[PDB]
Amino acid sequence: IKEEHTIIQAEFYLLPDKRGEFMFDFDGDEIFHVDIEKSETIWRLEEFAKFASFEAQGALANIAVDKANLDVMKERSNNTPDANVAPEVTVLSRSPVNLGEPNILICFIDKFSPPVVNVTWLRNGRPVTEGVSETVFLPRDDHLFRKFHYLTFLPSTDDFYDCEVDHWGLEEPLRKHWEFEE
């Protein structure tokens, strides 16, 4: 046969937020990323950990270089910034929805930069803070980013959900609505 694949090492440092990131991508999915502040390798799926390892220190070293390089670029360009690029937001369920069967809602945030966003899951208009998770900023084919936010839920006709996303490129927060629909 033929095994066509792409592996990507994506890294960045952002100002003025002073935030960095280092991750590995396999065919569009995250393999792992390194928690810069803890110097630890975080696998996207727990099962991956028993098949390999990565010295987190290598990512921190790279981030330090990206940080130094950012200053050179800011100087080289006379601190000339660009426009913020607002994201597209989509909310969908992970699996077919059946009343009373645990499921997961996905809030897909796409095509934006800089890689920073505020996200809030709302259930019946109120913020949900338990049973939620998110990915780091994932690379696209171009210069923009995407991200996934997740919410565990129990399908019911009495509820409705929203994924509220705010980004420096948006005039006002973007609230994407989702409701069960047999």
């Binding site: 066509e4 592996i7 090492q9 003025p16 999915d29 940080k67 660009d82 913020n84």
Partner: protein
């Protein structure tokens, strides 16, 4: 336990600047981003590999290292100083040129043990959808979810006759957690005898999966 290797980042140098690049915005909160993507392209496992390093400053890709070239090449004027500087450093150039081997091929062999062979069989289900009085064209839904890899084939049939028209799909949907899903819908006005069928083919299966309605 095999250790995944990372790509080495070169240090940039200053001493010069460019005449006002460009914004395309203004008023917005200023931000500055140094972003690098080192891409390993496997055309057939380790047999044929191309390394492509891409540097971005804010919204602009400005520098590139294509293993087939063997040197850095500016994409915009903002990356030219780095190309010239790094291309004049034989030691650094040799290190970059070797990464298609010390990083790309090295890491593939590791991932070939668990990512390349990952297989999750899809769950196929068929069901109608409208508002009761179909009025216009009716809609039949073939739901295929929870699968991996992304390569999949979903075909509709009208009495063994593959419908090549009236298809409405979400396309391949990536869930972000190493699973995919898709909905392939057929616009058609039912007729008892006239049976519709959804056939699904995927590399995790041995034989196609069919569902009638």
């Amino acid at each position: 336990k095999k250790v995944i290797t990372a790509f080495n980042d070169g240090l940039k140098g200053g001493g010069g600047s460019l005449v006002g690049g460009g914004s395309g915005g203004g008023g917005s909160r200023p931000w500055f981003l140094e972003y690098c993507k080192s891409e390993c392209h496997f055309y057939n496992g380790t047999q044929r590999v191309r390394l492509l390093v891409r540097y971005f400053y804010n919204l602009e890709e400005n520098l590139r290292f294509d293993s087939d070239v063997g040197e850095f090449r500016a994409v915009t004027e903002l990356g030219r100083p780095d190309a010239e500087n790094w291309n004049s450093q034989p030691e650094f150039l040799e290190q970059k040129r070797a990464e298609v081997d010390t990083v790309c091929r090295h890491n593939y062999e590791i991932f070939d043990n668990f990512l390349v062979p990952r297989r999750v069989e899809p769950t196929v289900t068929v069901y109608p959808t409208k508002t009761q009085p179909l009025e216009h064209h009716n809609l039949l839904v073939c739901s295929v979810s929870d699968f991996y890899p992304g390569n999949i084939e979903v075909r509709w049939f009208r009495n063994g006759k593959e419908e090549k028209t009236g298809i409405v799909s979400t396309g391949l949907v990536r869930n972000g957690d190493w699973t995919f899903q898709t909905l392939v819908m057929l616009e058609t006005v039912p007729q008892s005898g006239e049976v519709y069928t959804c056939q699904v083919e995927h590399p995790s299966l041995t034989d196609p999966v069919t569902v009638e309605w």
